[PDB]
């Protein structure tokens, strides 16, 4: 600013409603925080490996599952620096891959905690099937 869902032949309708900007500031703050926490030093190395990646994937078969949705990723791949192989300050106890994967894990955990509602409700069915049906009565089981 600044629908139809199909599942097993069933269509679900929704009605959106957005007329206030009280949460727009929070949304932009959290998205900019996620963007700032997501950038790392491995992106340059990943972008500097597109020819090798496409060569490896030419005889792999797992290409359509990414190119059916990566309509702009391929276009933006050639619009980057593509630097040559850099030189690390030390080659004994340096590993940016570990740092970037740790940062990604931390950010994923943070976003899962922020977007995850705490609800300790794990029921356990007995005898009958676990699937519930509209119009039946069940019990409460605490785990």
């Amino acid at each position: 600013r600044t629908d139809v869902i199909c599942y097993n032949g069933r269509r679900y309708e929704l009605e959106t409603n957005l007329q206030h900007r009280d949460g727009s500031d929070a949304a932009i703050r959290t998205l900019v925080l996620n963007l700032m926490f997501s950038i790392n030093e491995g992106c340059l190395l990943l972008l500097a490996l597109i020819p090798t990646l496409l060569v490896q994937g030419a005889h792999d078969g797992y290409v359509n599952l990414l190119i059916q949705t990566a309509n702009c990723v391929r276009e933006t791949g050639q619009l980057i620096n593509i630097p040559p192989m850099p030189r690390i300050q030390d080659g004994h106890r340096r590993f940016p891959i570990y740092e970037t994967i740790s940062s990604w894990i931390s950010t994923s955990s943070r976003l899962g905690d922020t977007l995850g509602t705490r609800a300790i409700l794990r029921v356990c069915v007995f005898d009958g099937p676990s699937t519930v049906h509209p119009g039946d009565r069940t019990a409460v089981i605490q785990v």
């Binding site: 040559p84 030189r87 300050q89 030390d90 080659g91 004994h92």
Partner: protein, 593 residues
Amino acid sequence: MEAHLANETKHALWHNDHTKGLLHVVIPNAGLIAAGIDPALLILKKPGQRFKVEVQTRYHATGQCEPWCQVFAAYIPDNALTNLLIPKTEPFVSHVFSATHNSGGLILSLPVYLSPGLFFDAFNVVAIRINTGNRKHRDICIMYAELIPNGTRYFADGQRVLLLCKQLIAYIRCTPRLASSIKIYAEHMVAAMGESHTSNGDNIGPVSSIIDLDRQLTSGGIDDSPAETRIQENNRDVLELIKRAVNIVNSLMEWFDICYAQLVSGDTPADFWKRRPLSIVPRHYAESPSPLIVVSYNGSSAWGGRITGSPILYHSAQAIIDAACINARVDNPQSLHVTARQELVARLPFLANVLNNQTPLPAFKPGAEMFLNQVFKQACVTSLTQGLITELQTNPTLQQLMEYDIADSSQTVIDEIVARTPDLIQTIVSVLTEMSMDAFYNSSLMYAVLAYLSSVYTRPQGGGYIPYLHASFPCWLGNRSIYLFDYYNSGGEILKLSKVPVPVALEKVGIGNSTQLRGKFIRSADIVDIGICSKYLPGQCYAYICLGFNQQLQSILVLPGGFAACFCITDTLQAALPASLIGPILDRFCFSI
């Protein structure tokens, strides 16, 4: 090699100010034998000293100076060549390769000037500061001619890698392990290097492959210059046309890298640059038989690198000067024609500041600090002795005046020293031409005198005089807190006895009338190497002579016997030495933020 590589990111991030180009320079440690110090305390031993090395420039009759450079390095003993050439294999260290008794090495940062107007000459001396004893520091001083010799060794490095690769191949093949695939692919790679070179010649040919530096540091200085390349290509074209006329008329390491990574399972910074040709820029001297090997990166467009074309040659700055000098058959450009002077000014913008005769200085002596400080110390000592002798001649009263803690049975010899004051002053005067001048040329007195003058003439353009670190800490606001006492014997002969002065506390009791002096002491909990000379009682075969000085160049006599003279020599130094003698001092010892 690790600290310098880590610190290289600061130079890498630099984009503007191309007048400071950092490069890797290796300084051999062959000259450390004459240092006379302990090598153990030079790398890692008793941390706290914080040894640092600074690099500064020295101009000539132009003014200003470089604001130093915060750099540091560490040495490496026990055959540093073996661990810097052969890849690090500490977990599986064995009897690999063969070499003689090697030595250590060091890396020093030296900025270089790169610009369209390169220019080259020998008129600047690089000063290196070492945080060691000022007595015989064993430093070096070279001009800019040795820094940029305009040469590189690109052909001699090819054979060095061949011996190492042959040795490693032989070592791999000598052990019967792994599988036959490695052997067969190594054989295929060897055969791929030549048809008749291996099938009809030899595969490896160890013969007499001994790791030594015989033809590597002797020839190959000027071999890849553009003129040499043109001559070589002309010769190759001539040979090709000769071969054509004779004919007409008669009458690839990918597998090796993978296997090395699988076997060694360890990387060192001295392996990535082995795949590309290196550059060697040695600069030896007769002072010590050790070449100054210089290594330059090949993957960057730095000085000496050859990755895109012709590197920096430092040309177009000598032919014009030679033509101007030979036009009138006069070497000195000062006595040349007006047209020659105008041409020199136009071609060399930096040379226009010498023709106008600005900031006059006698001749061109960059190394003037030594004898300048010697002359200043001699003048200060002569002024001090003149003041003390005049005050002694005009000294009122007689014998002792105040109490003085003197034993009853020891006072019979105290007056003997006082009665021999003319003999003492005569000996002091006469010793100026007999005592060695190498014992008081780098003491704390000259440093304190130099720091005292920092208050006056705080740069022609201003400055707060705020150093960062490693500066005159005892002399910051006043010299009345820390004193410098020199102990000398009595009689007809005076010679140096102590080694390092120790401050002695002093206070006045009486607040008027006959002033009294009674020294005190301050308990210190930071050092234990303190002499007991200062704590010695006034008795016990008399005592020494003390002459303290404050921050106002005021000397108070502490001679036992009830004699005390106060004279100021702050105005005598200015009268004898004018303000034109502090030119180099202000040029060098100045800093601003």
